[model samples]
Target: STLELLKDVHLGLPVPCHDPARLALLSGHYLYYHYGCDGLDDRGWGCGYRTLQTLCSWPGGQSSGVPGLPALQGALEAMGDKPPGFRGSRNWIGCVEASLCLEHFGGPQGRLCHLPRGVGLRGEEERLYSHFTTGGGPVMVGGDADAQSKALLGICEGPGSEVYVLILDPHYWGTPKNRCELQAAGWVGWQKVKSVFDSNSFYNLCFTRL
Candidate 1:
C-alpha cells in the first residue's frame, strides 16, 4: 500500500490568504514555533527539523509518526553533515539531511528531489511554485548557510516584478510579540524569491506525497 501525503499542516494560526493585507503590513505572522525545543541553545538552528515538524503535523487524515525535536535532533546528528572535528554542535541540516529524515520515516514511497547548491533559480522557480501550489506537500527550501531555511507553503504574484513565497520560517528567536515583530525577525511571511536568492544560494528539498 502506498503511504498518504499530508497537505496543509495545521499550525493553529491564521492562514495568510485569509488576510492578504497582513503580509503587506507585517511581512509575516507567527504561525507556529517548533514544539518541544524550548530553552535550548541550538533550538534556533533546527530550522530543517522544525520544517519537517510542520509538514508532518498537517492534518491530512493520516499519521506518519513524525518525530519531534529531541528525536529529530538525534537523527540529524547521526545522519546529517558535520564539519571536521565536529563535536555534535548545533549545525544546520541541508537537503540531504531533510531527504534522509523523510525517507527514514516516510518509508519506501518517500521521494526527495534536490536542487544543488549555487544553482540558479531561472528554470526552477516555476517548478517550485507548481509544487507549492499544486503539489500535495510543502517544499523544504534552504538558503545559503547564513540566511536559514523555511517550509514553503505557497506563492503570490503582484503587479510588476513582485513575486513572493509564503514561507513558514523556522527561526523565531526573541519570541516575536506580534505579526509586525514576526516579520521583522523573518518568521512567517511572503519572502521575495529574487531577493532571497540574491545573497544566498538556493537548495530545495521537495517531498512527494507518501
Candidate 2:
C-alpha cells in the first residue's frame, strides 16, 4: 500500500541527490522526486504531503552528490515495497544511506534471497564490497566503512534476514539515537557502521526493516 503511488510513475529529470553537496540534500530530495508528485502510495490514501523542515544550520548550500532519490526509488521498486515517512530524520549522512536502503531493499520479505549476491549501490567503489557481478568482481569499495554497512543490510534482506546495521557520523554526534529510533520503528539486522570518510568519529548504518 505504501508503494501504491509509485506503481506506475515515470520521471523526466535526473534525481537531485547526484549533485555535489553530497550529503545535505538527499532525504528531502528523495521524498519530493519520488513521492511528491502524487503523494506516497499509502494504499492510495492520497495523504497530503508537506515539505520536511529544511536544515537551518547546514554548511554551504542545500544539495549533494548523494545518490539520487530516484535511484532509491528504483531500489524500492526493485524490492516491491513503498517507503513510509522518514523513520528517523537525523543530519545529512543518515539521509544519504537511509534513502539508499529504502529505494533498493524495500520489497517483499524474501526478495533479497532471490537477488544475486554482491549486488551493490552505485559509486560504492570507495567502500568495501564490489558490485555483485555474474562473474568475477572487483575489490570492494570503501573498506571497513563499506564492509560493515553492506554486511548489515545484507542480513536484513538477505536469505537469513536476521540482523541490521546502524551508522554513526561522529561529525553528527547524535547518530546513536537515530539508530535506536530506527530499531524502534521495526528495523532489524542492525549494527553500528563505521565511516571510512571520517577518521575521527561518526557512523553511517544500514540493516533490515522488520
Task: Give the per-residue lDDT digits (tens) of candidate 1, residues 1-210.
Answer: 532322332233343343342122111111244423344445556776666655555434333465655666566556644434334556666656666766666532234565544434545656655554443455666534555667666665554535566666666655444555555555656666666555345466555453
Model 2 Cα lDDT, one tens digit per residue, 1-210? 232111101112122222322111111111111113332232211111111101110112132322333444444445554454332221122323343343443321111211112323222322222112211111111112222222221111223321122221111111223333433443222231222233243333221221
Q: Which regions of candidate 2 deviate over 4 angstroms?
A: 1-63, 70-152, 156-177, 190-210
The root-mean-square deviation over C-alpha atoms between each candidate and the true structure, in angstroms, is: 7.6, 17.2
Give the number of the best model, judged by lDDT: 1
TM-score, model 1 to reference = 0.62
The true-versus-predicted C-alpha distance at residue 73 of model 1, in Å, is 4.0
For model 2 the TM-score comes to: 0.18
Q: Residue 62 in model 2: shift from native, Å?
A: 14
Model 2, CA-based lDDT: 0.23
Candidate 1's clash total is 2
> What's the CA RMSD of model 1 in angstroms?
7.6
